[PDB]
């Protein structure tokens, strides 16, 4: 669909302080699929927005105390109902992959776009999430054709550190909706 100076035109915008420059002004070429839920296993909170913008209340839940120290973000969140929230312009570097490697290249934040699916490793994602992830990805392919050839899970670039998006992420279903 429509892109506007790094922003998905139809996304809900929640501009986060948590981004910086892609080194060398490099165009991203890798999509990294993640999952997230705050508190763990629970859906619907304002907590993901707060985490990715650096404003989470550490006392709001026991789990938040441990992650309040994190400086993280992602380009987009796709919620259970398909709502697309964007935090970081696609041309900028969001902080979503951490220590990672892809085809021999480290620091994957540099050249990837990170999209978060609200959910868990073992629960099915919703039809709305597959459709929306596809719409976002198709829009991305249009600007950054290399992404067609480079779609991966966080678990694939950070094995034995990360498990997201887990076995529950149906790559076949996702692929069927991409590049049409
Ligand atoms: Zn992840």
């Amino acid at each position: 669909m429509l892109l506007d100076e790094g922003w998905l035109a139809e996304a809900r915008r929640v501009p986060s302080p948590h981004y910086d420059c892609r080194p060398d002004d490099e165009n991203p070429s890798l999509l990294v699929v993640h999952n997230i839920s705050l508190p763990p296993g629970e859906f619907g909170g304002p907590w993901i927005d707060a985490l990715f913008t650096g404003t989470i209340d550490p006392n709001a839940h026991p789990y938040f105390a441990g992650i309040a120290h994190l400086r993280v973000s992602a380009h987009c969140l796709i919620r259970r109902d398909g709502e697309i929230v964007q935090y970081v312009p696609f041309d900028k570097r969001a902080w979503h992959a951490g220590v990672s490697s892809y085809q021999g290249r480290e620091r994957c934040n540099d050249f990837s776009i990170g999209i978060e699916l609200e959910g868990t490793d073992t629960l099915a994602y919703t039809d709305a999430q597959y459709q929306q992830l596809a719409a976002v990805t198709n829009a991305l392919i249009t600007r950054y054709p290399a992404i067609a050839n480079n779609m991966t899970g966080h678990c694939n670039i950070a094995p034995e550190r990360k498990t997201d998006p887990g076995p529950s992420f149906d790559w076949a279903r996702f692929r069927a909706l991409v590049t049409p």
Side-chain angles (χ1 to χ4, degrees):
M1 57 228 193
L2 207 294
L3 248 36
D4 172 11
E5 292 193 86
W7 295 88
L8 194 67
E10 301 185 341
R12 182 167 81 83
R13 301 193 196 186
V14 177
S16 167
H18 282 9
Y19 71 81
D20 54 8
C21 292
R22 287 185 193 286
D24 311 324
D25 288 340
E26 176 175 5
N27 295 316
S29 57
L30 174 65
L31 166 60
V32 180
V33 181
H34 298 264
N35 69 23
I36 187 168
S37 55
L38 290 173
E42 300 186 18
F43 311 140
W47 312 117
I48 304 164
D49 284 0
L51 177 69
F52 290 165
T53 55
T55 67
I56 201 168
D57 180 359
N59 296 310
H61 184 283
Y63 188 80
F64 297 171
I67 60 181
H69 71 99
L70 285 55
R71 264 181 170 237
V72 304
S73 58
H75 300 272
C76 305
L77 169 66
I78 303 180
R79 312 207 72 170
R80 302 299 287 186
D81 63 7
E83 174 188 23
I84 307 160
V85 183
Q86 188 168 174
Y87 306 96
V88 180
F90 295 127
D91 62 313
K92 302 301 200 314
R93 186 169 65 182
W95 306 333
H96 64 89
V99 177
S100 50
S101 187
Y102 177 81
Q103 307 184 346
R105 189 174 174 188
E106 296 186 338
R107 297 171 183 181
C108 292
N109 278 339
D110 291 0
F111 60 99
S112 65
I113 293 166
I115 305 295
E116 291 270 14
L117 307 168
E118 188 168 27
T120 72
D121 288 0
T122 58
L123 176 69
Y125 299 93
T126 65
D127 302 331
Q129 291 181 298
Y130 285 104
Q131 284 295 328
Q132 294 285 65
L133 181 60
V136 173
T137 299
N138 284 330
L140 289 174
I141 314 281
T142 296
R143 169 72 175 89
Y144 302 121
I147 287 174
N149 211 44
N150 298 284
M151 303 182 289
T152 199
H154 196 181
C155 59
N156 302 306
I157 62 178
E160 287 78 61
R161 199 170 66 74
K162 309 300 289 187
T163 56
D164 67 304
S168 61
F169 185 71
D170 186 341
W171 282 101
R173 168 120 77 133
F174 176 43
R175 285 189 184 274
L177 303 175
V178 175
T179 8

